[model samples]
Target: GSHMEEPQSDPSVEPPLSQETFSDLWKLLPENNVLSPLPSQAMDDLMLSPDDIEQWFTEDPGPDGSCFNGTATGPTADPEKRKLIQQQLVLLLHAHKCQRREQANGEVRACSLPHCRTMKNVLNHMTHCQAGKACQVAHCASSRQIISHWKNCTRHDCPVCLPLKNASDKR
Candidate 1:
């Protein structure tokens, strides 16, 4: 009867991976033959920490760079292992993108407005999304402008909406 140590990278749980998330990508290092003994998956192992993942993904390991370390007197290199790790990391990134807007309650909190959807003939809506009538502040002209106006739009403070008001006020 003892307390069990918790595993850090359980994506199966689908919990919001937060700052408290672990650096589990390192554990996926594929096995290889560059060394006399190949690498072991760090199931028992160990940052924005995406910065570390990105650095690892971009690494060009060869005679000169450090991609991994072996038991002793060891620096290791394996293209397949590196490529596998990067690929898995990409899968991780995509999960995050689809997860980018989901409110904790399960809806993606997005601009409640009208706009063209994009690219081809049925999609030239890329100019900008517009504000709903409640706060006709501006078209989604600014970066993150959709959600930006979600909270910030108001009669006195909003830009385009202010101009519209002034035009009717006697200017």
Candidate 2:
């Protein structure tokens, strides 16, 4: 008995992932081949650092040609992988959006303001989306603008909300 070096057991019992608060690569598995490899890679990359994740998400190239080793390979060449990854990413982004507004606490902020529901619709559609070099925020209220504020709040900050603000301001 003394010669034994502790019997082998499930590695998933280790600390960190031991708590449901965190997850590890070994525990990750999906029937779909495309998504199967991603959770592990994503968890490993996330374990590294926020900067690493940023570089990975940005393809390590920020407008410039520089590349980070872990940077995202940029939209998987495979259509199925790309679609699956995109769907998962969008869901995560949506969760983050809710968290940013302090809405994750189970508090539902009702739209009491006029056109509030419509604004939320726009926000859900446009928030946290990326384009060429900048990220966009969907400020639904910005869509409604008084003629005087048009020049100041012009779609300059947001293109999607700009039209709405312009429409209201014209009235």
Candidate 3:
């Protein structure tokens, strides 16, 4: 009650740093310094949530409307058109897998997920089911669904599946 003023201690201020400086710090570590190989294997543990599954319709998940032009109402309007388109898909599949053919020159913005990477490359089997080289999905909508179907379509024998597939196992 007698003292009218108390002592105040001031902390030193830190030097200001830019965002790029923090990002630059990230590159200070070398890739080999960390576990480099196990991340892809961890992909088997990846799963899609129900929320992610519900977005396919709104995803605009296919080619230009012009592809189906003058033929019918839309992509699914007539079974004939659908079947023909399916045949084209089949052709692209065959082309993608033909090892005899030359390599593809340009790269497409494929799914970056682990299983999707494997599907995009499907080089393991080397059979004639390579299905993505012909796919030009500028509006890649839902990559998970697309790559999930692609793995099977390309006969990849992959662990990648829609919702669940490591079936018959239970806790």
lDDT of 1 at 56: 28
Whichever of 2 and 3 has more TM-score, that candidate is 3
lDDT tens readout by residue for model 2, 83-113 = 3333333223223233334443356554342
- Residue 94 displacement in candidate 2 (angstroms): 7.5
Q: 122 in model 1: Cα distance from truth in Å?
A: 37
RMSD of every prediction:
25.8, 21.3, 19.6
lDDT of 3 by residue, 28-49 (tens): 3222221112334333343433
Model 2: lDDT equals: 0.30
C-alpha lDDT of residue 4 in model 3? 32
Could you tell me the TM-score of candidate 1?
A: 0.19
Q: Count the backbone clashes (under 3 Å) in each candidate.
A: 2, 2, 0
Total residue pair clashes for candidate 2:
2
What TM-score fits each model? 0.19, 0.20, 0.22
Query: Where is the poorest 10-residue window by lDDT in model 2?
Result: 17-26
Better of 1 and 3 by TM-score: 3
Weakest 10 consecutive residues of candidate 3 by summed lDDT: 162-171
TM-score of model 2 vs. true structure: 0.20
For candidate 1, write residues 1-171 as lDDT tens digits: 475323334444432322112122112222221111111431112202222332322324467666444312332244433443333332332232222333332644533212111111111122233432222322212112222332354445443334323322211
